[PDB]
Design a protein around this nucleic acid. Structure first.
Ligand SMILES: [Zn+2]
Lengths: 60, 154, 128, 99, 78, 112
RNA sequence: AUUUAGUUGGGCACUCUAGCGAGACUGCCGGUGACAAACCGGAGGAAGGUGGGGAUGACGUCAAAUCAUCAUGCCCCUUAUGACCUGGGCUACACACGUGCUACAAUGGGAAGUACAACGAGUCGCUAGACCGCGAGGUCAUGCAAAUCUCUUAAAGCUUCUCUCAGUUCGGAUUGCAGGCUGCAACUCGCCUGCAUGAAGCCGGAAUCGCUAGUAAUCGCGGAUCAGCACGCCGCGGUGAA
């Protein structure tokens, strides 16, 4: 039962406190970045793909 | 540790008393670097000595270095697993370590109902032959040459 | 007018010293020796290079430093006297250097690693 | 003097080479250029784990560096204003213009 | 809450507004978990539904500061 | 008994004669002693009887109740006997948020 | 000079930011050492023998774990296991264990004043000033796309009396009341203030673990997922042992 919850959030919400977001290529409800609209692990992997603008590895 | 030796980081003297080992006595009660409470009430306790049976704090600090002084020390050096040690000749580094650890961790053991009268009576004891830290020097004299039954095959 | 310029960097606090010939004071944030500082304003801590150069002196200090506690930015005081004596006396510089007095501490806050609690404090290894 | 622009991007070299290009075009038609002001480069943080199901401790972090430039111009002319309203090249870098 | 406006659900209010000055009924099947009580509700007997099986309760005059779901829990605790 | 309402210790100062009592903590005692405006001086109570009986009447103003436990008993007599679920949860010692009793029983029952 | 302010006269002077550079690389010297590596000591130097720290984990070792990121062959259904709604719950407590926080006290408190940063976040998001509150806060209304302005003048110290040794000016557990704010709403199932009982705790037994220095031990600031919801997390700074 995964394809109901992909088309679920594209509706306008029933009330104001159900506006939760997730990833778009995948469907992780936990640990989505609101400034990205990507989930956790796809940011890491697509960052290793060399396609996300900006982001570099970190060492200091 | 395993590779070789290591430094010891000797302490600087006070800019008030001008004595190095007084700083070593400061830096064993002081918790979280709180010099404001603990070191100042140590100042207050040695001034209590100065006001009652005392003249100068440096001389009575040397008098405490007399009557607490660890003359010997043992260290458990097993060979085959058993309780094996010997009264070793103490370094004046480790002499000061043992003696001031006796004084400070007996000021822990004392626990009198004023936060510096425990220190005042602690250094009135450690400076004037009394208190159980001087009796810890007595008991250190005791086990010196009392574990010697297994310390003469060396 | 006569005034000096000596900078000093310890514990993330630059310290510009406007040293003027006086009697030996401080106006730290234009405040005196204990209008800003508690009793930990000790003699051999602050007034160390006066015992090797301009003995006993001293001259009055103007400075503006923030960063660190009372003992941190007081460590920036020695760099001010170091750069002041650097400005003033070339022949006492060797007596400064053999007594040290100019070796800047390169220490900052240590980098705190993930996977642990702190920079070095590993977690409680609760084996069993 | 009533002309000022901002230059904001990720890196440093493309920003300040384009800054030198537009400083060239500005002080060519007139004079009196101000400084190509380095801004202290606000930095981000992120913290992402490596695995999927377990193993929270295996961190793998990412950050962002955003250099910024401010350019003022003293004593302008209508020609440097025409240079700054019909030339915003390069297009890979974005600018923030005022007057 | 209640003093900055009573929080009573409107169409269930419209179910109980229809029988204000009428006879005290026995059963009104509802959901009864969100609306609080202000004292013009005295006398009824409305079927409180827990989530699995509804259990009714009658209404006295003392009920002034709570809801209907505070008496049929979701426990089945034994 | 003794000199001011109930629960009075003897030869203790004025904040103690309102602090120990079943019904008044400290800040109400602070405002009541601020209404009169007297000093403790220091820990002993050897002062005039007119002030002690005056502040006795000032305690007789307030709700220092010998049947305050009966008041809370009638409050919980209503509370446990409408239904009620918070009447059950009152004796559970658990608030209106849920308190997650997985080790939280040592307050009342002592589950050892 | 003016000042309540560094207003604008003043330029980047010191500082600061970021651009190119120089820089600590056995770079030089004395001795040990076969003249060999290397070692012990100097000189210069801010940094001496890879300055402190990060990114970067070979072959493989362990059927370690991931079909609950996604792809995915094989066996199963497709008037149901697919899909839509209302209430619930994953937060319950007869017990055991791992982790985090608070005191168990005369090194702790209360009244007073007085201090010291860095990393950031920020235009339906942070609140200037003033008003009214024991208070959660509310009210008039300003700024702020950021080196301007909002969180945002950090805490332990410093100097007085104090509880002057008690379940106690140690401490705050559960409970009645005044409330405050988010939401469509805070019994299930958010957080906080204040008023009122003042719980237990009166330094922990085997067995443990963190760690060789601005580090242990300790005190504050911000950020994430987020309308609301940190003793957790991720950093940053402050004091600083053996
Ligand atoms: Zn994704």
């Amino acid at each position: 039962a995964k394809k109901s919850m992909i088309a679920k959030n594209k509706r306008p919400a029933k009330h104001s406190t159900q506006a939760y977001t997730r990833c778009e290529r995948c469907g992780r409800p936990h640990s989505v970045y609101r400034k990205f609209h990507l989930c956790r692990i796809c940011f890491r992997e697509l960052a290793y793909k060399g396609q996300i603008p900006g982001v570099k590895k970190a060492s200091w | 540790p395993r590779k070789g030796p290591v430094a010891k980081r000797d302490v600087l003297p006070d800019p008030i008393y001008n004595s190095k080992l007084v700083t070593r006595l400061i830096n064993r009660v002081m918790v979280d670097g709180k010099r404001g409470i603990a070191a100042n009430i140590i100042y207050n306790s040695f001034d209590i000595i100065k006001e009652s049976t005392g003249n100068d704090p440096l001389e009575v600090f040397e008098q405490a270095m007399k009557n607490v002084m660890p003359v010997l020390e043992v260290k458990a050096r097993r060979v085959g697993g058993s309780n094996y040690q010997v009264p070793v000749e103490v370094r004046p580094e480790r002499r000061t370590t043992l003696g001031l650890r006796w004084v400070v961790n007996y000021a822990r053991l004392r626990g009198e109902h004023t936060m510096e009268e425990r220190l005042a009576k602690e250094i009135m004891d450690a400076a004037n032959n009394t208190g159980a830290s001087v009796k810890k020097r007595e008991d250190t004299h005791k086990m010196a040459d009392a574990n010697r039954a297994f310390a003469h095959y060396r | 007018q006569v005034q000096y310029s000596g900078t000093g960097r310890r514990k993330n606090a630059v310290a510009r010293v406007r040293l003027v010939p006086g009697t030996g004071k401080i106006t730290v944030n234009k405040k005196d020796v204990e209008e800003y500082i508690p009793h930990a304003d000790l003699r051999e801590v602050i007034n160390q290079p006066f015992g090797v150069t301009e003995t006993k002196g001293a001259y009055d200090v103007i400075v503006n430093v923030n960063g660190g506690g009372y003992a941190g930015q007081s460590g920036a005081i020695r760099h001010g006297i170091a750069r002041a004596l650097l400005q003033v006396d070339p022949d006492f510089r060797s007596a400064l250097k053999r007594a040290g007095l100019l070796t800047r501490d390169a220490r900052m806050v240590e980098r705190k690693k993930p996977g642990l609690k702190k920079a070095r404090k590993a977690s409680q290894f609760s084996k069993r | 003097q009533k002309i000022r622009i901002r230059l904001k991007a990720y890196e440093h070299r493309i920003l300040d080479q384009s800054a030198d290009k537009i400083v060239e075009t500005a002080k060519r038609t007139g004079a009196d250029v101000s400084g190509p002001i380095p801004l202290p480069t606000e930095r981000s943080l992120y913290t992402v784990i490596r695995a999927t199901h377990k193993y929270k401790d295996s961190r793998e972090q990412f950050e962002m560096r955003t250099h910024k430039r401010l350019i003022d111009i003293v004593n302008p002319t209508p020609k440097t204003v025409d240079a700054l309203m019909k030339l915003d090249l390069p297009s890979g870098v974005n600018i923030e213009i005022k007057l | 809450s209640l003093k900055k406006g009573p929080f009573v659900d409107d169409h269930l209010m419209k179910k109980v507004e229809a029988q204000q000055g009428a006879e005290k009924k026995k059963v009104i099947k509802t959901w009864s978990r969100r609306s609080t009580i202000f004292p013009s509700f005295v006398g009824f007997t409305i079927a409180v539904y827990d989530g699995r099986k509804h259990v009714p309760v009658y209404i006295q005059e003392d009920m002034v500061g709570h809801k209907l779901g505070e008496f049929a829990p979701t426990r089945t605790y034994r | 008994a003794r000199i001011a309402g109930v629960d009075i210790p003897r030869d203790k100062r004025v904040v103690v004669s309102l602090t120990y009592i079943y019904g008044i903590g400290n800040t109400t005692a602070k405002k009541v002693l601020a209404n009169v405006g007297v000093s403790e001086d220091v820990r002993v109570r050897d002062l005039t009887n007119e002030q002690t009986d005056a502040i006795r009447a000032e305690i007789d103003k307030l709700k220092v109740e010998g049947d305050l436990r009966r008041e809370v008993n009638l409050n919980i007599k209503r509370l446990m006997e409408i239904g009620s679920y918070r009447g059950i949860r009152h004796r559970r010692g658990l608030p209106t948020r849920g308190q997650n009793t997985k080790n939280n029983a040592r307050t009342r029952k002592g589950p050892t």
